[PDB]
Amino acid sequence: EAVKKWVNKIIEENIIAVFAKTECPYCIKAISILKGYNLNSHMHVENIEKNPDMANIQAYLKELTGKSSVPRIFINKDVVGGCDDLVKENDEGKLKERLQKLGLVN
Ligand SMILES: [Cl-]
Ligand SMILES: [Cl-]
Structure with a gap:
């Protein structure tokens, strides 16, 4: 229960939620693309490798x-x-349309 609630809170509290790990090139690429749309104020990145419950x-x-x-x-x-x-x-074009509907890009 606890792990699920913790993951849920990250997804619920942050419009853009990225689960990542240490030195992960495709994590870095994805986060950079997202940061390129000026989403940082509504973004949360969680490093789940630095966590005792990674597998869960x-x-x-x-x-x-x-x-x-x-x-x-x-x-x-x-x-x-x-x-x-x-x-x-x-x-x-799906990403920008997503973000437009959320008011995150003009
Ligand atoms: Cl998928
Ligand atoms: Cl995939």
Whole structure:
């Protein structure tokens, strides 16, 4: 229960929620893309490797999204997925439309 509540709070309190780990190039790329849309004020990045319950967090992220790998990316509680998913949404215009609907970009 405790791990799930903790993960939920991160996703609920932050419009943009990224679960990451230490020295993870696709985490860094995803976060940089997101920071490039000036989202920092509504972004939270959680390093789940520096955590005693990493495996439990990963298992719950898999229950929520289908994958246990990081990065895992949520926007307004909606599952974006990983960095590749973000790149697809970014290149095809879905990401900006997401952010426009949230008032995060003009
Ligand atoms: Cl996914
Ligand atoms: Cl994926």
